[PDB]
């Protein structure tokens, strides 16, 4: 006999809501993963990707990727998210140097040619390209930086061709004994063993769920309902709550709003640019008075 | 023993396929000193490299 506290009064969501921006074009998978020419690793090419749908299932006919590793995001979530600014870094390396396109790695490519940051969000994709970048006499059009006085900073590109002083005598701008040109030719042949064969590498870098996003996955948007507890998906950010109209004035570079507990309590709707306030549906404590289970 | 571990001279001629360090990050390898250094060398097939 007494009075006992219980779980607070919770209301379950009624339906699901997906709100993605109005984008119709597909992302240039042919222009990135099926380009006629790829850049050298010392002069790696960075391409900006915007205003498209990341439907990578269309790659399934003609990709055959040997390396696909994502870092800040699980791959199975990639179809349910939106990406704010997307950059594709394309180059060609040896087969043995693909492992150097991971963060926190050492080696000639990771120190002198291409470095990834310690906090890297994105996916590294690499595939064999011996049928494209190799010829019988030897393809020597792909260069790498062999000599440098210091390691590269993350996402830094060095295209200098200054003569490297490998010994003690100064070079005076000319090459000779212990004075070498810093760029060296890859030797690509079809009869080369794997690891000495050309590999095409595309590194996709993006930032998630903090800025307005423009590249989005293949999710069909639904209607926007208000004043009801729903499951929402705003630009890849999922959640549960009631969405109501808001008088918050978002600055044009902002997409989400946070309270003192740093949870998302305001959002800009991507189709109709209106500010919505998110309010959790569960509220209010519940107690139960009994005169005893034995008594009644 | 009694030598400088400057592995950058391996960049000319090595082309390693497997390089995995366990007790130390690779990027710290230029900033450290090593006390009891041993090299165990052998030959296996590829499938046993793992």
């Amino acid at each position: 006999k007494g009075i006992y506290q219980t779980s607070n009064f919770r209301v379950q969501p009624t339906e699901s809501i997906v709100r993605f921006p109005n984008i119709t074009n597909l992302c240039p998978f042919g222009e990135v993963f099926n380009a006629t020419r790829f850049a050298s690793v010392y002069a790696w090419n960075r391409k900006r990707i915007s205003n498209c749908v990341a439907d990578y299932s269309v790659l399934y006919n003609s990709a055959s990727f040997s390396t696909f590793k994502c870092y800040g995001v699980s791959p199975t979530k990639l179809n349910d998210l939106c990406f704010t600014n997307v950059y594709a870094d394309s180059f060609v390396i040896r087969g043995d140097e693909v492992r150097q396109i991971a963060p926190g790695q050492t080696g000639k490519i990771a120190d002198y040619n291409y470095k990834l940051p310690d906090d890297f969000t994105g996916c590294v994709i690499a595939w064999n390209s011996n049928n494209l970048d190799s010829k019988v006499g030897g393809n020597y059009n792909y260069l790498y930086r062999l000599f440098r006085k210091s390691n590269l900073k993350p996402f830094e590109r060095d295209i200098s061709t200054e003569i490297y002083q490998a010994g003690s005598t100064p070079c005076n701008g000319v090459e000779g004994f212990n004075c070498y040109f810093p760029l060296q030719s890859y030797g690509f042949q079809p009869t080369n063993g794997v690891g000495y064969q050309p590999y095409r590498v595309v590194v996709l870098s993006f930032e998630l769920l903090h800025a307005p996003a423009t590249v989005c996955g293949p999710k069909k948007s639904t209607n926007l309902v208000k004043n009801k507890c729903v499951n929402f998906n705003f630009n890849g950010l999922t959640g549960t709550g009631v969405l109501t109209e808001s008088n918050k004035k978002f600055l044009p570079f902002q997409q989400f709003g946070r309270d003192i507990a740093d949870t998302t309590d305001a959002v800009r709707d991507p189709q109709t640019l209106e500010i919505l306030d998110i309010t959790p549906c569960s509220f209010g404590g519940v107690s139960v008075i009994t005169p005893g289970t034995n008594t009644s | 023993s009694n030598c400088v571990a400057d592995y950058s001279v391996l960049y000319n001629s090595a082309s390693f396929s497997t390089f995995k360090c366990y007790g130390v990050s690779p990027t710290k390898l230029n900033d450290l000193c090593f006390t009891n250094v041993y090299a165990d060398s052998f030959v296996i097939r590829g499938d046993e490299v793992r």
Binding site: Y140, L146, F181, L183, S185 | S13
Partner: peptide
């Protein structure tokens, strides 16, 4: 070859 063996970007040739 773009350069002779030992010169240019062909230093590591032969």
């Amino acid at each position: 070859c773009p350069y002779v063996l030992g010169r240019x970007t062909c230093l590591x040739c032969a």
